[PDB]
């Protein structure tokens, strides 16, 4: 069926103040069916909190639109969030001592580009510990690989979270 909606929402930061629902809504629908689109706004004064989000029909819509950035809203860049800590490095665990910077490359390419790829060796023997560091050229690219259950590189089921 549907994925679950958490997954289909994007955070929508940086609004001109004169951003409403409407004119949101028009700019994003471009890369997909929005099934909502919200200005966030103060209760007692409606003035603009300055961000929004809007909720595609499909993940693929959400990567349509993080594609297409930077986003020019009414006049002003906007940043646009998946559902924040918002890094550009992932750590890589459970890679083991056969695992090459090529299949780190060739995997994890098709999320982002590349910028850093780190294989930890022992500081003492030079040996391969089992863990790895990837930097991306922006943050989206480790959104997308954080959320996923599972993810196999070389064979091997490895562990993935975001790193400072
Ligand atoms: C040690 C290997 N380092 C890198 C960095 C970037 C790319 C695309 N590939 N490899």
Same mark, same amino acid.
């Given at each position: 069926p549907k994925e679950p909606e958490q997954l289909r929402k994007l955070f929508i930061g940086?609004?001109?103040?004169?951003?409403?629902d409407e004119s949101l809504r028009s700019h994003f629908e471009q890369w997909g069916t929005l099934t909502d689109c919200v200005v966030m706004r103060d209760?007692?004064? %409606?003035?603009?909190?300055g961000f929004g989000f809007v909720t595609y029909a499909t993940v693929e819509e959400v990567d349509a639109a993080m594609n297409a950035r930077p986003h020019k809203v009414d006049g002003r860049v906007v940043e646009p969030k998946r559902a924040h800590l918002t890094v550009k490095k992932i750590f890589v665990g459970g890679?083991?001592?056969?695992?090459?910077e090529h299949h780190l490359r060739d995997y994890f390419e098709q999320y982002g580009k590349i910028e850093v790829i780190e294989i930890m060796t022992d500081?003492?023997?030079? %040996?391969?510990?089992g863990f790895a560091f990837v930097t991306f050229d922006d943050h989206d690219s480790v959104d997308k690989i954080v959320i996923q259950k599972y993810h196999t590189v070389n064979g091997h089921n490895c562990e993935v979270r975001k790193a400072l």
């Open positions: 940086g609004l001109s103040f004169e951003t409403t209760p007692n004064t %409606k003035r603009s909190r890679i083991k001592e056969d695992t090459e500081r003492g023997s030079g %040996k391969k510990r």
